[PDB]
């Protein structure tokens, strides 16, 4: 389970800027913090973990000052290093079964430039040389360094471990996939691309293949894992066959939420009927 705090900061000019961030434990969103807002918002009932109303308030205020501070710093760094500017900051820890490890990566205009490593900021190999001075300035602050180290070394792992027992439930929830078939013209003359749509499954790991009874098709392509709004997943597995060779193919879906009982969709009664309920005029088709 990888826990990441993700910060988005935009600087349009000297006077206008905003910063927004969100927090992910695994693929679940736990917090959100908008520029419009004073405080960090929970997106789960258990987002506080095992910290107490006092402990969290202190950690919150800590962040509240940071956000104001980070803002003025960068504006000043820019006056030093003679807009528009985008900064991205990713920090957290990947929990091992032990034990763990931490990270605080910073990106500038889309590129990965700085990390916090050991007791200070350093520029990542192959970084621009103008950043040397800003890092020299930023490393002269003992106070930030101290608080950042505690955050990474002690505070972050002790927090996440709180979430993993508090969100025991929502993390180990199971959701059954629902699949359906369809096909589209291939890019090749007289071939057909067949689609097996799989939707609404959690957790993420899943097995989808095109079969011919025994032999699973080697031309089976797995698409990207796309998200649903309700924290479930979407995948499609496609197969290119020469038109008139669809007959005898089957989509097979293996996922932990079913147990032993797969979804085996055959190309041809069940199929025919579902293809009738999704008919349309085919504008526009790509």
């Amino acid at each position: 389970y990888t826990f990441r705090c993700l910060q988005m900061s935009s600087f349009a000019n000297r006077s206008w800027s905003r910063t927004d961030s969100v927090v992910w434990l695994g693929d679940l969103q736990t917090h959100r913090w908008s520029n419009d807002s004073a405080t960090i918002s929970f997106t789960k009932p258990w987002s506080q973990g095992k910290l107490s109303n006092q402990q969290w308030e202190k950690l919150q205020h800590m962040f509240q000052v940071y956000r104001v501070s980070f803002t003025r710093d960068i504006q000043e760094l820019v006056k030093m290093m003679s807009y528009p500017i985008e900064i991205q900051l990713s920090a957290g820890c990947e929990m091992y079964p032990g034990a763990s490890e931490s990270f605080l990566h910073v990106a500038f205009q889309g590129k990965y430039v700085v990390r916090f490593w050991g007791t200070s900021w350093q520029t990542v190999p192959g970084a621009p040389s103008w950043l040397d001075l800003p890092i020299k300035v930023l490393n002269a602050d003992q106070g930030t360094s101290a608080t950042v180290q505690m955050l990474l070394n002690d505070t972050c792992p002790l927090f996440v471990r709180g979430l993993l027992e508090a969100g025991k439930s929502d993390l180990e929830k199971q959701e059954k996939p629902v699949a359906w078939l369809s096909s589209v013209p291939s890019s090749a003359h007289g071939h057909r691309q067949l689609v097996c749509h799989v939707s609404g499954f959690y957790p993420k790991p899943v097995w989808v293949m095109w079969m011919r009874g025994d032999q699973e098709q080697q031309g089976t392509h797995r698409g990207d894992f796309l998200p649903n709004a309700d924290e479930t997943w979407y995948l499609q597995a496609t197969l290119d066959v020469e038109a008139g060779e669809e007959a005898g193919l089957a989509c097979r879906v293996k996922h932990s939420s079913l147990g032993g009982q797969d979804i085996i969709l055959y190309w041809g009664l069940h199929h025919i009927l579902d293809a009738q309920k999704m008919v349309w005029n085919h504008r526009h088709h790509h």
């Epitope: 000052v65 501070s69 003025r72 710093d73 000043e76 760094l77 006056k79 030093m80 003679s82 300035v137 930023l138 002269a140 602050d141 003992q142 106070g143 930030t144």
Partner: T-cell receptor, first 107, second 113 residues
Framework: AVTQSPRNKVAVTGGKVTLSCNQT?????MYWYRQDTGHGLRLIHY???????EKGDIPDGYKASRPSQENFSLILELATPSQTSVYFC???????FGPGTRLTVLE | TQVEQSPQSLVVRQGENSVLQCNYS??????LRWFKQDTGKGLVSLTV?????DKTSNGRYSATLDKDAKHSTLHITATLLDDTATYIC?????????????FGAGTQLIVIP
């Protein structure tokens, strides 16, 4: 360390006044404050190195300039009574302050 | 007006002790510095206080810091006639070159013979 010239100056409303700071410390950051009773020092203009110049909290009426690491002038294009004060430049990374300049602008 | 100093002017018998108060609301408060200003001359640093509960000593000068209360006091042991100057409290909002200094209007200490 930090030298200032002139130390005393008398101007007319609408005159030009340059106040010169100089440092042999080799610092990058130079500042210009002004001191008035009941205030505590107030930043007019500051600098991060040669050729760079910045607005402080009260820069109205003042242009500054940093030709080199060593020198940081505060310039008063159109002097006004309001600008009667004691001015201090400081150098450093926090700071080290000059012996001050006393300016009067008279009607 | 984030740094306020107390009392406004102080008067001590030459030989006695004097106490100077400083209250600030600057956020954040990285460090606090006491300066001496000999009438006619510039500011000169006496001491800096860093930690959440700090206490320093510069010979006859001794200072205390309390961030939880956002407060510092400067003590002078066995005041001299040389001590007749203005004492200025300055707070720094970062631990580096990017910080802004925040100046108190000062305390005027007259040391009577």
């Amino acid at each position: 360390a930090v030298t200032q010239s002139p130390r005393n100056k008398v101007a007319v409303t609408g005159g030009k006044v340059t106040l010169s700071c100089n440092q042999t410390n080799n610092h990058n950051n130079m500042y210009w404050y002004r001191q008035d009773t009941g205030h505590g020092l107030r930043l007019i203009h500051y600098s991060y190195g040669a050729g760079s110049t910045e607005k402080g909290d009260i820069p109205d009426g003042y242009k500054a300039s940093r030709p080199s690491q060593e020198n940081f002038s505060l310039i008063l294009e159109l002097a006004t009574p309001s600008q009667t004060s004691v001015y201090f430049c400081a150098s450093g990374d926090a700071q080290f302050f000059g012996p001050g300049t006393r300016l009067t602008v008279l009607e | 007006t984030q740094v306020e100093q107390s009392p406004q002017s102080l008067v001590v018998r030459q030989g006695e002790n004097s106490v100077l108060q400083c209250n600030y609301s600057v956020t954040p408060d990285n460090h606090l510095r006491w300066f001496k200003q000999d009438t006619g001359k510039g500011l000169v640093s006496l001491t800096v206080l860093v930690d959440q509960k700090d206490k320093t000593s510069n010979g006859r000068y001794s200072a205390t810091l309390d961030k939880d209360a956002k407060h510092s006091t400067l003590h002078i042991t066995a005041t001299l006639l040389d001590d007749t100057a203005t004492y200025i409290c300055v707070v720094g909002d970062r631990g580096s070159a990017l910080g802004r200094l925040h100046f108190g209007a000062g305390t005027q200490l007259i040391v009577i013979p």
